[PDB]
Amino acid sequence: TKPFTVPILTVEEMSNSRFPIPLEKLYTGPSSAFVVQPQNGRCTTDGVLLGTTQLSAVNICTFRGDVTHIAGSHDYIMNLASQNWNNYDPTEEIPAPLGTPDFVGKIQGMLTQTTREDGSTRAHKATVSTGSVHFTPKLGSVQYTTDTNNDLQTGQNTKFTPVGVIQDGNNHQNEPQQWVLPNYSGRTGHNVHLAPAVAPTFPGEQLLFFRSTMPGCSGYPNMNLDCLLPQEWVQHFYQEAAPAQSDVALLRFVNPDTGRVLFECKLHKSGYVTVAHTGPHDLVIPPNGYFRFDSWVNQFYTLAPMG
Amino acid sequence: TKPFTVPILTVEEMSNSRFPIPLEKLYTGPSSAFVVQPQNGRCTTDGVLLGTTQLSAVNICTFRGDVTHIAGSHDYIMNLASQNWNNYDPTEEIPAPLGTPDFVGKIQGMLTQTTREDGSTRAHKATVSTGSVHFTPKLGSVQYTTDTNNDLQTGQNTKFTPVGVIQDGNNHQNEPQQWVLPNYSGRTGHNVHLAPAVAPTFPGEQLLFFRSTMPGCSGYPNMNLDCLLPQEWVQHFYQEAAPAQSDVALLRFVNPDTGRVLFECKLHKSGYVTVAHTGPHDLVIPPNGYFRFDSWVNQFYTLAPMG
Numbered sequence A, B: 001t002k003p004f005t006v007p008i009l010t011v012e013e014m015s016n017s018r019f020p021i022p023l024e025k026l027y028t029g030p031s032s033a034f035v036v037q038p039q040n041g042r043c044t045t046d047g048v049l050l051g052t053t054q055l056s057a058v059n060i061c062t063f064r065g066d067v068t069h070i071a072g073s074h075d076y077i078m079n080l081a082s083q084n085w086n087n088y089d090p091t092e093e094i095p096a097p098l099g100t101p102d103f104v105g106k107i108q109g110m111l112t113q114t115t116r117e118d119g120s121t122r123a124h125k126a127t128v129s130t131g132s133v134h135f136t137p138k139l140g141s142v143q144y145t146t147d148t149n150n151d152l153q154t155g156q157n158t159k160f161t162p163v164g165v166i167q168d169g170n171n172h173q174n175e176p177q178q179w180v181l182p183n184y185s186g187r188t189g190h191n192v193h194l195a196p197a198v199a200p201t202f203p204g205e206q207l208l209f210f211r212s213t214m215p216g217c218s219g220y221p222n223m224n225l226d227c228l229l230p231q232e233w234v235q236h237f238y239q240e241a242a243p244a245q246s247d248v249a250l251l252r253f254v255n256p257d258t259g260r261v262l263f264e265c266k267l268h269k270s271g272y273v274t275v276a277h278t279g280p281h282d283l284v285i286p287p288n289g290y291f292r293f294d295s296w297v298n299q300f301y302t303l304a305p306m307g
């Protein structure tokens, strides 16, 4: 049978699947108090993409299309196009355009556009609030608040490149809310075709998150961003498409230097990881360590307590 | 022997290896009038990374470190740290920090920083001119021109996220110059440990470039960006590390739908591609097509004319 495997990349050599930035560390903790249902970075070990997950690490949280000024403000409406600048098809059985951000927050970046006729270009700092009623990706439109009100032109390809997140008001780190999905269709209707919510079912286990620190652009934002799978893992499963021989793949985090294993964990065929541990914990790992698929096991396999 | 292969991704599903943006099209044309010696996106089919090439698609053209204001200006000096925020080692036998931009141009993006003590954050538009004498990556420092002169703090992690390129003066598209390497050490000394220059040696052949359109942020910039290998190809060869059985791997661009081949090309073990064609040409390809390694051939193999 097509042997299953995970890439041999180290945590720092990989990218976060929920925002275009590299992974930084591994984190585990209880999740019973949240609804863990991210839409980006979702894929079966079988290679089946889920939610709004797409292959490009750099295309996550980016938008493309054309814009029109909101008279009397420094705001603009962008009529979305697909990443390749083609028409966006709302008919597809997906939650929203692939790569759409999957959390409620204020993402700041830059809008850039070129005038086809003469090749003149321009850029403006802008922020898109995913918690806003005007955040309607699925319907084909999103809104930005910018610093300008006269330089962006109508009917010209425009792109939004994400940089980081901002926060307002006292009560620091109150936003963004990484575990709260935005309303892809606004008030027009509920979210559709979502990748399922995830939770550790085996007693004594907790989810293992691949963590990054989203850059902050203003205020006191909660910058923690946890994904269920590194972007390269999504890329790998997709191309390998190896058949899962059980519902659980046993992985060992090994140090290529010493050749020794640090801990083992469960990669569920559904596309998420759990370890045997109770309580929040920032994992200390050798910079050169990586994951290695060792064997398929039963869903009733008890993991060696994490260390 | 470990069978050699290239990823099954389509052009649009892949990323440019010289700037954090997706690939858009395939381009070929004469290169005898230029010095094709890019440092990013360089890797042997064997999996040996070259120049300033690193694995992360999102880390290309990004800088990390701390900054200090240049009194009397809106400029800042950044003392570089490695991508993981650790000390930058100038001793390494590399041209400059992995991921350093490899072309002379004015790259605009945003500097973001967080104050460790209270978690307050800030962001400012900034541009780094790689043709400036102050562009000294290899020495551990680069300079930015910004829109502020009082909000960035000293001794605080700061990151530069690239967005696009700008241009000044009449004579449009004069810059950037994608084939002109910047002086990594400034005037302190010549560039060192460069990946070799590349050129088609076989009569009737031209290099095959993987092209993207860098977003423009101001003026009339030449936005064309050609890399020798998709970033995922670099990632793939690195992990696969399959032994080259000849100096030339024959690839066929195939359409997974019709199952038919469009054209064939040469992937030199050194890490670049050539096709049989004379003159500039924007390749028209089926959106679902991809490359497939079919066989190792002699360096004297004549390619079927490209179509």
Ligand SMILES: C[C@@H]1O[C@@H](O[C@@H]2[C@@H](O[C@H]3O[C@H](CO)[C@H](O)[C@H](O)[C@H]3O)[C@@H](O)[C@@H](CO)O[C@H]2O)[C@@H](O)[C@H](O)[C@@H]1O
Residues within 6 Å of the ligand: A218, A219, A220, B120, B121, B122, B123, B124, B148, B151
């Ligand atoms: C927490 C605080 O956030 C930033 O300040 C914002 C402020 O932004 C503007 O003013 C600052 C300093 O005067 C910089 O120039 C920014 O570039 C400006 O955009 C506004 O968003 C107001 C609205 O209440 O709140 C402040 O907190 C940041 O610049 C500060 O350094 C600091 O991190």
Ligand SMILES: C[C@@H]1O[C@@H](O[C@@H]2[C@@H](O[C@H]3O[C@H](CO)[C@H](O)[C@H](O)[C@H]3O)[C@@H](O)[C@@H](CO)O[C@H]2O)[C@@H](O)[C@H](O)[C@@H]1O
Residues within 6 Å of the ligand: A120, A121, A122, A123, A124, A148, A151, B218, B219, B220
């Ligand atoms: C080619 C031209 O480039 C941009 O204009 C720049 C200009 O930028 C400022 O002014 C414009 C319009 O007044 C926008 O507000 C920008 O956001 C500003 O930064 C400067 O760089 C000057 C210096 O000569 O040159 C202009 O060409 C762009 O905004 C224009 O739309 C246009 O594409």
